Design a protein around this ligand. Structure first.
Ligand SMILES: O=c1[nH]c2cnc3ccc(Cl)cc3c2[nH]c1=O
Ligand code: NI
Length: 341
């Protein structure tokens, strides 16, 4: 059954709640982004209105085959009226098409649902500016001070320089990047751009990227693996066995594999800066784990919440254990006491 933190009180709206059958009283289902945990349940048989970004709408229609009559894409940063309620979609700085949702309840209550997001000071100059928010449904994925990682800029700079140096030293090296889902596309796009190559990938992954409204994708992606020296593979294949098997299939065109595993936070980030990251190596294969996060760090999350000054916070991640809930409520009170709201 649909949990409480996916319900918007005072409306007939749910958020990322497609795996609970027909939710009681839901006139419109909002989808924050196209990640499996959040769209779980949608298919060509869904017969209720889905509200989402245009990019998420492209993915629902092409990847899940949802009928167009049930897809309601909304522009970003635009006050829209949905079933008599004013709503705004804001960029969540997560994966392509990911949004936060502002709900203007009829009784005057204002609710911000972040979906999944990586907080950034640029959000302090969105439509949230000088907007009273009474309730915040917060992506609390990394809501603990030990969760530190670099900016996406620094990680991409490390990936670009690492890939460019390796391929310049060995023109016969292949660069491989692992992928879970949508998101973190900048990793393989920036590597291919510095190497003068297109990104080769499966037809299914190619189809997914064609839905993302990225300007000039036909410039950087392709399904012709032989024409590419930057290949996309499923994240599970980014291991020594999986990469050895892939290299045998390249027809003797390459004698070395440089592989990147885009991860979230890992325990290595407690001791190792991005500049000092080193790979796992076995023979002619090296694997880099790079902390490219599309979720807020603790400090980014704290800064955003202390700026927004919500009257109530409802976590949407790490809600399953009393220890996590107690830990998160303690930090919420700390932020409130320090900031003074
Ligand atoms: O949509 C999303 N789903 C999920 C699901 N499981 C996860 C497990 C671990 C970490 Cl670090 C991130 C996760 C995640 N992040 C997303 O953005
Ligand atoms: Ni997500």
């Amino acid at each position: 059954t649909c949990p409480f933190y996916k319900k918007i009180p005072g409306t007939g709206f749910t958020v990322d709640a497609f795996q609970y059958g027909v939710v009681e009283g839901c006139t419109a289902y909002f989808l924050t982004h196209f990640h499996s945990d959040h769209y779980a349940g949608l298919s060509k048989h869904f017969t209720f209105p889905v509200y989402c970004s245009e990019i998420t709408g492209n993915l629902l229609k092409n990847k899940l085959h949802v009928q167009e009559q049930y897809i309601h894409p909304l522009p970003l940063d635009t006050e829209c009226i949905v079933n008599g309620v004013k709503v705004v979609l804001l960029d969540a700085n997560h994966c392509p098409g990911a949004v936060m949702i502002l709900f203007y309840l009829p009784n005057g209550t204002v609710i911000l649902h972040t979906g999944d997001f990586r907080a950034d000071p640029s959000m302090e100059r969105s439509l949230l500016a000088d907007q009273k928010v009474h309730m915040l449904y917060l992506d609390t994925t990394y809501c603990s001070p030990e969760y530190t990682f670099p900016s996406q800029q620094e990680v991409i700079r490390f990936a670009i320089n690492t890939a460019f140096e390796a391929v310049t030293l060995n023109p016969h090296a292949l660069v491989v990047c692992g992928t879970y889902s949508i998101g973190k596309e900048k990793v393989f796009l920036a590597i291919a751009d510095v190497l003068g190559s297109k990104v080769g990938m499966s037809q299914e992954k190619y189809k997914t990227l064609q839905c993302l409204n990225i300007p000039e994708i036909n410039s950087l992606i392709t399904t012709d693996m032989c024409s590419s020296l930057v290949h996309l593979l499923p994240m599970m294949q980014i291991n020594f066995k999986g990469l050895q098997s892939h290299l045998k299939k390249c027809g003797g065109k390459y004698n070395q594999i440089l592989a990147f595993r885009p991860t979230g936070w890992t325990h290595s980030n407690k001791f190792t800066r991005i500049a000092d990251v080193i790979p796992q190596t076995k023979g002619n294969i090296s694997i880099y784990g790079i902390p490219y996060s599309e979720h807020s760090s603790y400090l980014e999350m704290k800064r955003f919440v202390q700026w927004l000054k919500p009257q109530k916070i409802i976590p949407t991640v790490n809600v399953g254990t009393w220890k996590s809930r107690s830990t998160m409520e303690k930090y919420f009170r700390e932020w409130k006491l320090e900031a003074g709201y």
